[PDB]
Every structure is written in structure tokens, then in C-alpha cells.
Copies of this chain bind each other. A is one copy, B any other.
Amino acid sequence: SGEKTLAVVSASSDDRPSTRGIINDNTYALGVFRTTANTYAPLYNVKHIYSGGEWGADDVIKVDYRNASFFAYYPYHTATGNYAGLAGGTTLTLQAQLFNAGEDICYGAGEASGGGPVSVYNPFVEFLNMKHAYARLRLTLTRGEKFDKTKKCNIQNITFKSNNANFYLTRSLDIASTAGATGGSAVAAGYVHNPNVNIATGKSVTYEYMFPPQPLDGSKLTILVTVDGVTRSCDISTLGSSLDSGKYYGVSLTFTDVGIILSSAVVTVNNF
């Protein structure tokens, strides 16, 4: 026999302040792909489930003398909606939305256990150091001590724009590429989230978002908030020149009697 059954050994993510480390949970599955590199027939979104210290599949994948190129993403999704491009391809859609752990995709190339290529001579692949695709942002809105006591502090139409011009609502991600988020079209209306909530005296509300990584023109993120019917605009120039997948962004807005106290934060990993 010139072929052996492939074994998916491990999967891990090393980017971002809070790392996934080696994935050892059942909760989510791993979607496995094989490209046409070295004349192999392509494999798309093969669902692998963590069982018996490895990632098992209902299907059998074979590797012969040819060196095989594998890619994986996590958490696995059925190839529909924003994941329709994974049915017979390696592209998925990243969409600006409220944070959802199930959508917080990481992806990467597979390599042979102990390095070298994956073939019948070493039919073991690992998906280590997968990178996250989305940029996370936490927005806190606080009713300041000096905010007008007669007003409701009603919050509507939280709007995100690069340089008060536009924002990418959706972008593409090729899980067989290292480009990260690419393509898409920047929308002039920006990303709009309308919670329509009243912030009571001394209280705060926090929203968690996930956005496709994208440039911040002139290093500016504009946030528009309609406070008790009045449209307010905040320019944030201290988040860097782009929203990046490996970083956690924080914006805090405190509404006072005369303005907004703006607190911006960037969390990153600097490894030795």
C-alpha cells in the first residue's frame, strides 16, 4: 500500500492577549481542507471532532508519496450563509456584528508533527498557531456624575466609521492564505448598532463587537452616538492606523454636563 490514513493531531491558537492555547474542548469542531498542491484532489470543510487526544472525522483522508497541503479553521461551520464559500472553496465572509464566540474564527496551515512535509512517510498533521480573523472591540458608555439629571441618557445608533467617512461591514477571508481580511467594500453609513437603551444615574452599558480588520484612515476611528436625540461625534486617534485581528480594542465614553470623557485602549502581545 502506497497510502496511509491522515491523523489530525492537534490544533492551537497563539495570537491575541488571551490565547486559546492547545484546543482540548469538544464544544467546537475543526473544519479541514486540502488544496490541489502537488496534484492532490481538493478537500473542503471536512468536519473534525476532538476525540481520543486527536481530531477525528467520519471521513477518511489519505496521503500518499505526494506532500499534502492542509488548512483548517475553528470553530467549524456548515458551509452556508457567511460560510457559503467554504462549500467548494476556502473563502468565508467576515461581518461587523455584536460579539459571538461561535463566530470568532481562527485559521491556519497544517504542518507535519515534528516538522517537514505531510505524506504517507509522516501521515500526521497539526494546526498550531492559528490566527484569529476578527478584531474585537469593547465599547463602554457611562452616564457621568454631572450628566443632566432630567434627561434619560437614551442611546441610539452607535455608528463606527474610519475617518468619519466609511467602514467595512463585510470582508473576505481566505483560510488557505496569510493575507487576513481582504476585499469587501467600505460603506459610507458605517457600522450601526441601535440598542435604544436608557442609561440610569451613575450606570454604564458595555457592548462587545467583532469587526473585519480594516484601515483607520489618518489613524482615526470616529464613533457617532445619538444621546437623547442629539447626534454626537468622537474622533479616536490612539488605536493605531488599523483595526487588527491580534489586538483587543477598548473605547469608553462618559457623558458629562458639557461633553464626553473619551478613554481608548489597545491590548496587544509582545513575545520574546
Known: A238-B238, A240-B237. A261 touches B265 (CB 8 A): no
The CA of A160 and the CA of B142, in the complex, are separated in Å by: 32
Contacts of A269 in B (CB 8 A): 256, 259-262
Q: Is the interface of A mostly helix, strand, loop or mixed?
A: strand
Using a CB-CB cutoff of 8 Å, which residues 237-260 of chain A contact chain B?
237-240, 250, 254, 256, 258-260
Nearest chain B CB to A184 CB, angstrom units: 24
In whole angstroms, what is the CA distance A262 to B239 when docked? Answer: 13
> When chains A and B are docked, how far (Å) is the Cα of A272 from the Cα of B272?
44
Tell me which residues across on chain B come within 8 A of A266, comparing CB atoms: 238, 263-265
User: A250, B270: Cβ atoms under 8 Å?
Assistant: no
A238-B266, A259-B272, A263-B268 are known contacts; what are 14 more A-B pairs with Cβ within 8 Å? A17-B263, A232-B272, A234-B270, A237-B240, A238-B239, A238-B264, A256-B269, A258-B272, A259-B269, A259-B271, A260-B270, A260-B271, A261-B268, A262-B267
| A68 CA / B269 CA spacing, docked (Å) | 56
Interface pair B261/A264, CB less than 8 Å apart:
no
User: Is the Cβ of A261 less than 8 Å from the Cβ of B272?
Assistant: no
Classify chain A's interface size. 20 to 34
Residue of B234, B240, B254, B258 near A238 (CB, 8 A) is B240
Q: In the complex, what distance in Å separates the CA atom of A262 from the CA atom of B267?
A: 6
A235 contacts B by Cβ under 8 Å: yes
Q: Are A258 and B271 in contact (CB under 8 A)?
A: yes
Q: Are B265 and A250 in contact (CB under 8 A)?
A: yes
CB-nearest residue of chain B to A269: B261
What is the chain B residue whose CB lies nearest that of A234? Answer: B270
Asked whether B264 lies within 8 Å of A270 as measured between CB atoms, the reply is: no
Q: Which one of A237, A240, A261 has the highest number of Cβ atoms from chain B below 10 Å of its Cβ?
A: A261
Known: A234-B270, A240-B237. A265 touches B262 (CB 8 A): no
Which chain B residue lies CB-closest to A17?
B261
Smallest Cβ-Cβ distance to A240: which chain B residue:
B238
